[PDB]
RNA sequence: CGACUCUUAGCGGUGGAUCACUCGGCUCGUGCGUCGAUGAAGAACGCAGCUAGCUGCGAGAAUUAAUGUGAAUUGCAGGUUGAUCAUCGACACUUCGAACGCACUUGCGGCCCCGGGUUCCUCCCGGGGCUACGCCUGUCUGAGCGUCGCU
RNA sequence: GCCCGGGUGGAGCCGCCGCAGGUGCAGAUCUUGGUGGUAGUAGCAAAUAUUCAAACGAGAACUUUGAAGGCCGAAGUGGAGAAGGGUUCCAUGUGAACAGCAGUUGAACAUGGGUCAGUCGGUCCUGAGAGAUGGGCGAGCGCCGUUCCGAAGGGACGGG
RNA sequence: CCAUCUAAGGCUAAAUACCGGCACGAGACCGAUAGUCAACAAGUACCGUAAGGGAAAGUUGAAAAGAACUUUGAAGAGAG
RNA sequence: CGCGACCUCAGAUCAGACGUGGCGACCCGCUGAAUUUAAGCAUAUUAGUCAGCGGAGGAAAAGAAACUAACCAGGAUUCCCUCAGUAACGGCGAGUGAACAGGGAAGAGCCCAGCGCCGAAUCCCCGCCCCGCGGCGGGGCGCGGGAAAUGUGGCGUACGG
């Protein structure tokens, strides 16, 4: 899991925020691995990843990256979408398959928190005043 | 003793001129700038001081290349051609 | 200090060059509002930072 | 603050009533003169000219 | 008396460099005269000699780079100076060919079912 | 009334543009009307003033029937100097007094090739405008 | 504190509501822009209907409105097939088509 | 009576209120919506005949070329085949800075090619071009009691 | 609250019917700016001390020269440096402001000048320590670590 | 028993957002102690080792026509 | 032992490319308080907000149902009105709080893996010739090199093929 990075305990404040070593990260280890690979290889684009093995203290993932400036993909019509600037650092913006799972994206009554783009968008839309011109 | 008498002992400086931001904030012993964090690749910028952010933002200096591209943009970055001679 | 670095000496040189008063033909241009140099620095009063 | 209530809405029937009242009052010489307009030479204040 | 860029274009590099050297020595003489005390006529000429030097250097550089890019136009790899210089983002877009080409499945689809021009009666 | 949305009627904006116009806009701004004879001859009403046109002064302390040759045009101060309008200062030296071109009428022009090109262009445009107005 | 008599109120202004305020001063400009875009597209598609493709008849899916009739998303494949229209040609000749809709009746 | 003090008025000081001006703000709206290893933003240092600041500019340094315009710039001097302004597509663009040979004193190098010493025989001096990290495709040179095949 | 008269002033202003508000001050140890009495008052008293003559000059207790009498008394009120200062150094000129009296004087102001290295230092070495790569950790900017989980030598006599 | 979809792979314009930037238009707004801190050589002078803090300051006149010349004073400064 | 394949892994100032940093009003992913309210206060509230970190574009994100419904049924995403201060949560206190349907703005749908069939029918790069080349492309010739059967291309994707 993820323990809170606080000096000894000292998460100063009300007792509801006193937790240290039973908290859980909001993103999955697969997403963490993809983001690490993307950060190390900044000239490539992350496509997807998969699980290949694990043990008590480690999890092993193989991640596919694509070199966006190779002619072999820049001349292929159906895979040149990834060469667009819009698709930079999908793993860092949570756009890969593993990253998307943590955003709570879905359709139906289970996913009302993210009507719109995401949680940010839903919260914004619900928490503004529409002061009309006439009222 | 803790005041006027003590003020006479200060004769060696803590900071010097930074090689990147130019301010007198380069701590010698730590070898680090206290204004821009020079040894770090990314510049030091916190948005809990909008005044500090606006003191050294993009619009403050010469803008000696951005100013040119701002007017090159108004012709679609025309390049490799000249107006018709007389 | 007699011992000094090249960049320190250059900065001192620029600051010393900046300390002259304005030329007498400035104040009687047309679109002029300057009466004197207001940025003059004296070594006793202001200590150049550094 | 910019979100002051700058605009107001009026009922459509009230707007039409105001328009009708203004039109009716424009046809009375006393009211038009009291508005300050110089119409002492006008042949007929419901002044109508052809479509030419 | 006045050196202009129009008539320096046809000349080749050797006499251009010679004229540049003459202008440089004239400028040096002007500077030393200014220091030792000279007429205002000699003081004013400093700017004109500096600008003439600038004109000569500009013509030299212009002709040199024109010839260089004319010689390099017929080659696959060009120096970065001669490569087109637009914004870094536009320099790494898909070019016209790889932006326009389409997969033959889509070619088949748009050949079989093209858009039609039509209207409906009221 | 102005209807073009891309031209401003703001007082401060207009004054700022007027007082920081560059020199080649100053040339346009400091234009003065032609005399009646020149207007009838060239079918042109106004002309930007040049260095050595001569002038009748219409308004001010120096208005009169004296033809005066312009000596130089001070565009920075929005002024022209005429060789006859002038006053003596305390020490006795004589200095020119500034006159705005708008209060000035040309007696005859300095016919340079560019001047006659401008005159013919203005006349042609005015004549085609009148013909369209027919 | 409560006054003599009145209603208990729960105003939802305990957050920083003043930072997220949507003024509507651009409403007329938005209407003008939408209009201009509408006429621009109408001119772009020269003889074609301005509204767009025809749509189908549907019943509102609720006890409150099942007596009313809407305009649907698009014609379904059963209707196209029994009307003799190809699913690919309908879209290019002006018929809105969706494959999700069934036909119970 | 005279001095001093007090009150009111005239005048004169002191001070900078009021009023009238406004190349400045604030707010709303519209179109566009563009940085960077081909070296950004930022900083430093320099550049004017007389120039400190502001502004502009980069050893071509208050600007070169080209186009438009058409007789100025101006505080004083000096000097239409195009002065000055504007536009800006050619060219140029010092040192730091992601900053890139190593370090930050501007210290110390390495390799290749030119010009001086030589008359390459090596040093020495000057000039020019390279010498950062990560990563992709390919090339070359390799390593392995890793899996094998022939001897 | 307002209306007239007189004076100053030099370019805009008001009445009535409506509309709108950042709309009326004696105070808040209110904010900013200005000015009083105090008051020509407190004060210009730490470290012994000055005097005569002349010159310059509008102007001399304070400047310069000469003479006399004194002090610092070699752990100095002397002669040189480090840090720090950054032109304060030197010459000429001025006496508006500053040097809490004054000044013919100044570390003031204004014009000009002035710092020359193979051998004097920096530059090199390493000290206490600081800090990359490999590696590890880390959501992450990054952090730990300095030989530790590294294929860590681009050198050389000689021989072909 | 019914109803409805086919997860754990991927792309996709428009309607939408915009206190930064470029270029504009406007206002029942403020009118130099106001309005941005900044109408002016303002993020300037200046303070702090540093993080950072941060001002004051608009108006001759239509045109400099900005007071020649005489006189007292060393001059500031006066009288004509 | 030697020679030769393949695998795995190194070294390069090897040929050619790509990333870094900045701005950050709007956007996406994390982390994330305490003032304050409750007339005290610890759950709550402030608030998934400030601060902190990362990553973009001219918009971003979302998106063509593992949907809504229970009706005589609708049919991607996004945005506005309404649903509604409602269902609900809450020391059930203070307070918090959506969605479906309905009307509109806009409106656009598609592609792989797999399953199979086609003599790998596929792709990248070097040399020469021809075209224009300031968004390095088209055609031909190379007993030129490589990738790829540990699977490239054509048909084809739930609406069936
Ligand atoms: Mg969280
Ligand atoms: Mg799950
Ligand atoms: Mg940052
Ligand atoms: Mg001091
Ligand atoms: Mg017009
Ligand atoms: Mg009460
Ligand atoms: Mg009540
Ligand atoms: Mg009195
Ligand atoms: Mg200068
Ligand atoms: Mg030119
Ligand atoms: Mg020209
Ligand atoms: Mg050192
Ligand atoms: Mg006036
Ligand atoms: Mg008001
Ligand atoms: Mg008061
Ligand atoms: Mg006394
Ligand atoms: Mg001593
Ligand atoms: Mg001494
Ligand atoms: Mg001295
Ligand atoms: Mg004194
Ligand atoms: Mg010697
Ligand atoms: Mg470390
Ligand atoms: Mg599926
Ligand atoms: Mg899907
Ligand atoms: Mg997507
Ligand atoms: Mg309007
Ligand atoms: Mg005032
Ligand atoms: Mg005043
Ligand atoms: Mg309380
Ligand atoms: Mg309490
Ligand atoms: Mg709590
Ligand atoms: Mg919460
Ligand atoms: Mg934040
Ligand atoms: Mg970035
Ligand atoms: Mg961009
Ligand atoms: Mg998108
Ligand atoms: Mg589907
Ligand atoms: Mg829906
Ligand atoms: Mg209700
Ligand atoms: Mg209770
Ligand atoms: Mg909540
Ligand atoms: Mg709905
Ligand atoms: Mg519609
Ligand atoms: Mg296949
Ligand atoms: Zn710094």
Explain the overall architecture:
This is part of a larger assembly, with seven protein chains of seven kinds. Chain C is 24% helix and 0% strand. Chain C is an all-alpha fold and 50 residues long. Chain E contains five helices and no strands. With 122 residues, chain E is an all-alpha fold. Chain E has helices at 13-36, 40-72, 88-91, 96-100, 104-112. With 105 residues, chain G is of the alpha+beta class. Chain G is built from three helices and three strands; from the N terminus they run E-H-E-E-H-H. Chain G has helices at 27-44, 77-82, 87-93, and strands spanning 21-23, 57-59, 69-71. The longest helix of chain G is centred in the middle third of the chain and has 18 residues, at 27-44. The chains are: A alpha+beta (135), B alpha+beta (86), C mainly alpha (50), D mainly alpha (52), E mainly alpha (122), F alpha+beta (134), G alpha+beta (105). Chains in contact: A-D, A-E, A-G, B-C, B-E, E-G. The B-E interface holds B 69, 77, 79-80 and E 84-87, 90. Strand 3 (129-131) of chain A pairs parallel with strand 1 of chain G. The complex binds magnesium ion (44 copies) and zinc ion (ZN). One magnesium ion binds at residues 3-4, 6 of chain G. Chain A binds four RNA strands through helix 1, helix 3 and helix 4. Chain C: Keywords: Ribonucleoprotein, Ribosomal protein. Chain C: GO terms for molecular function: structural constituent of ribosome.
Given the structure, what is the number of helices of chain E? Answer: 5
How much helicity do the residues of chain E have?
55-70%
Outline type of chain F: globular
Using the alpha-carbon principal axes, give the shape of chain E.
elongated
**Radius of gyration of CA atoms of chain F, rounded to a whole number:** 17 Å
What strand line-up does the widest sheet of chain F have?
5-4-3-8
Main sheet of chain F? 4 strands, antiparallel
PDB class: membrane protein
Keywords: Sec61, RNA binding protein, eEF2, cada, 60S
Entry title: Cryo-EM structure of ribosome-Sec61-TRAP (TRanslocon Associated Protein) translocon complex
Chain A: Ribosomal protein L15
């Amino acid at each position: 899991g993820r323990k809170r990075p606080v000096p000894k305990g000292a998460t100063y404040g009300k007792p509801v925020h006193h937790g240290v070593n039973q908290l859980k990260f909001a993103r999955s280890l697969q997403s963490v691995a993809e983001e690490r690979a993307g950060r190390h290889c900044g000239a490539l684009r992350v496509l997807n990843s998969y699980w290949v093995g694990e043990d008590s203290t480690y999890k092993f993932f193989e991640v596919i990256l694509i070199d966006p400036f190779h002619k072999a993909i820049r001349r292929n019509p159906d895979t040149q979408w990834i060469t667009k600037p819009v698709h930079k650092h999908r793993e860092m913006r949570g756009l890969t398959s593993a990253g998307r799972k943590s955003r709570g994206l879905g359709k139906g009554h289970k996913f009302h928190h993210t009507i719109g783009g995401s949680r940010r968008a839903a919260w914004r839309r619900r928490n503004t005043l529409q002061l009309h011109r006439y009222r | 003793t803790k005041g006027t008498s003590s003020f006479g002992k200060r004769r060696n400086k803590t900071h010097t001129l930074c090689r990147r931001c130019g301010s007198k904030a380069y701590h010698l012993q730590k070898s680090t700038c206290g204004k821009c964090g020079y040894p770090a690749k990314r510049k030091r910028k916190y948005n809990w001081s909008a005044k500090a952010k606006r003191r050294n933002t993009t619009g403050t200096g010469r803008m000696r290349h951005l100013k040119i591209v701002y007017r090159r943009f108004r012709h679609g970055f025309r390049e490799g051609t000249t107006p018709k001679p007389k | 200090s007699s011992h000094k670095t090249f960049r320190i000496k250059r900065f001192l040189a620029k600051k010393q060059k900046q300390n002259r008063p304005i030329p007498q033909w400035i104040w009687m241009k047309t679109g002029n509002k300057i009466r004197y140099n207001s940025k003059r620095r004296h070594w006793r009063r202001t200590k150049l930072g550094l | 603050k910019t979100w002051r209530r700058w605009h107001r809405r009026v009922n459509t029937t009230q707007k039409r009533y105001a328009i009708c009242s203004a039109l009716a009052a424009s046809a009375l010489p006393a009211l038009v003169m009291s508005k300050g307009h110089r119409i002492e030479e006008v042949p007929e204040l419901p002044l109508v000219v052809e479509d030419k | 008396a006045k050196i202009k860029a129009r008539d320096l274009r046809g000349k080749k590099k050797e006499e251009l460099l010679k004229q540049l050297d003459d202008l440089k020595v004239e400028l040096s003489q002007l500077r030393v005269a200014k220091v030792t005390g000279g007429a205002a006529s000699k003081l004013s000429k400093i700017r004109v000699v500096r600008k003439s030097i600038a004109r000569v250097l500009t013509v030299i550089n212009q002709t040199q780079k024109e010839n260089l890019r004319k010689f390099y136009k017929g080659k696959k790899y060009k120096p970065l100076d001669l490569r087109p210089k637009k914004t870094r983002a536009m320099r790494r877009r898909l070019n016209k060919h790889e932006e326009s080409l389409k997969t033959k499945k889509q070619q088949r689809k748009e050949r079989l079912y093209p858009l039609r021009k039509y209207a409906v009666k009221a | 009334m102005k209807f073009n949305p891309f031209v401003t009627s703001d007082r401060s904006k207009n004054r700022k543009r007027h007082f920081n116009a560059p020199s080649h806009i100053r040339r346009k701004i400091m234009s003065s009307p032609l005399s009646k004879e020149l207007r009838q001859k060239y079918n042109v009403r106004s002309m930007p003033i040049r260095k050595d046109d001569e002038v009748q002064v219409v308004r001010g302390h120096y208005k009169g029937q004296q033809i005066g040759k312009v000596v130089q045009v001070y565009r920075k101060k929005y002024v022209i100097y005429i060789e006859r309008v002038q006053r003596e200062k305390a020490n006795g030296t004589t200095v020119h007094v500034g006159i705005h071109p708008s209060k000035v009428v040309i007696t005859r022009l300095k016919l340079d090739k560019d001047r006659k090109k401008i005159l013919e262009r203005k006349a042609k445009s005015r004549q085609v405008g009148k013909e369209k107005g027919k | 504190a409560p006054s003599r008599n009145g209603m208990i109120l729960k105003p939802h202004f305990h957050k920083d509501w003043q930072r997220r305020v949507a003024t509507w001063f651009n409403q007329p400009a938005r209407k003008i822009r939408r209009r201009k875009a509408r006429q621009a597209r109408a001119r772009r598609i020269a003889p074609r209907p301005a509204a767009g493709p025809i749509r189908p008849i549907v019943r509102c899916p609720t006890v409150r409105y099942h007596t009313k009739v809407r305009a649907g998303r698009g014609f379904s494949l059963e209707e196209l097939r029994v009307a003799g229209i190809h699913k690919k040609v309908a879209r290019t000749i002006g018929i809105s088509v969706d494959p999700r809709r069934r036909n119970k009746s």
